[model samples]
Target: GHTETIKEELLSYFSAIHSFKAEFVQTSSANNDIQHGMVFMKKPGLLKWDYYPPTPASIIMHGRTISYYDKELEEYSYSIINNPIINLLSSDIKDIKDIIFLNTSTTDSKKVITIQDQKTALLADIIFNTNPITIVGLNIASPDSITYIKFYNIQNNITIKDTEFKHST
Candidate 1:
């Protein structure tokens, strides 16, 4: 009963984010590759991950569509938004049909949320810092590897431009 209560309380705080922008470092722990990037997110169904130099991948989600771009090949693809990555970056209060909550823990006054992708079984360990309240980092685990994301200069409740949602090339 107490565990359930604690999870519910945490859920309330997790669902409170409307929009955020940040610079991030995403590391694949199984490999040595680290991606430096910027992430912009808005409520309901919009988010984008723009990778910096040396990394060739970028992702954008607008409405129900997801677009992936590879800079080297100068090609991109489109798909439906149906992953746990989109769920955490989107509105938590909205429907999350792709994600399954696994567990919750606290470390050094920060909240860690473990969630899974129901289809691919990708597990993401999402971290949040409270007091001022913000999402600070994440670790996503797949069958063979894990990706770690650390955020910096996090700004929330700020106006993000609409053009960022649309991807070119």
Candidate 2:
């Protein structure tokens, strides 16, 4: 199965991504899911994401509270550290052994693993390169639909600042 392969790749990538800057473009089939953002991860449990293209929004999770800033609404939303969505995204567990694969057969050219909760599900599907073990695309599925997030022009393992995780007025 590709689960173990993904786990190892993610573990290595996460460890290597101590600090990185990359452009993330996400789109859905309905045209309602357009978003362009930049994500910076300073540590395993700390990350800041700012989206500007389709809309203006910022998400900062310091391994604790997940803060969302909506520029259009000029408002903010905060969720607890244990929030379901945040828990899944900010999780520190990086190994494949830490996850459960919902699907058994893996011949669809897409390998998916679903992390389920009592109320929701988090699905991660990877599209591999010619080598099956190399990830070329990472998709995150939510209740509404799937958001395909592609990473391009990435620079990994550089030192970043705490201020990168702090939103300024």
Candidate 3:
């Protein structure tokens, strides 16, 4: 009963985020290549992931479409897709149809809430710092491997320009 209560609280907290930007470190369980990037997200479907260095790429989600651009190769592509993580950030909890909460756990002062996408089988463990109740990181596990991302220098409810959602290439 208590777990269910916190689940609702956390879901609402995430859904209430109108905009956020953060510097992040992304790592994979299957490889040693660590990626550093900056992520910008805004409500009503606007998101961008601009990665740096060795393998530079940008992925933008504008409306129902997802666009990918390789900075070095000057190649780009886009398609309409429903991404579970984006849905969590941009849609209301009641509007989320493809993802379900699996479980939750706590470590130290942090909470890890696990969710899974019914269609893509993408499982995500969303980590939150409990004292002030804010998201700190996420671990996304796919069929083959897991990707962990930790966010720092996070700024929320800030004005993110719409132009950032467009791929220049």
- In terms of lDDT, which candidate is strongest? 3
Cα lDDT for residue 98, candidate 3: 67
Q: 71-128, model 3: which lDDT tens digit per residue?
A: 8888998888767674465555665666667777877988888887888889988887
Which pairs of residues collide in model 3?
A: none
RMSD of each: 2.7, 4.6, 2.4
What candidate 1 gets wrong by more than 4 Å, as runs, is 1-7, 62-64, 69-76
Error of 3 at 78 (Å): 1.5
> How well does each candidate superpose onto the true structure, as a TM-score?
0.82, 0.66, 0.85
lDDT of 1 by residue, 1-169 (tens): 2445555755676567778999998877677877799998887678888998787678887655779898878888999755656446675543546556677787689888777777778888778886678888878887898778899999987898777777684
**Model 2: per-residue lDDT, tens digit, 70-89?**
98887888876643433333
Ranked by TM-score, top first: 3, 1, 2
Off by over 4 Å in 2: 2-9, 30-33, 81-91, 94-98, 101-119, 126-136, 142-144
Error of 1 at 145 (Å): 0.8
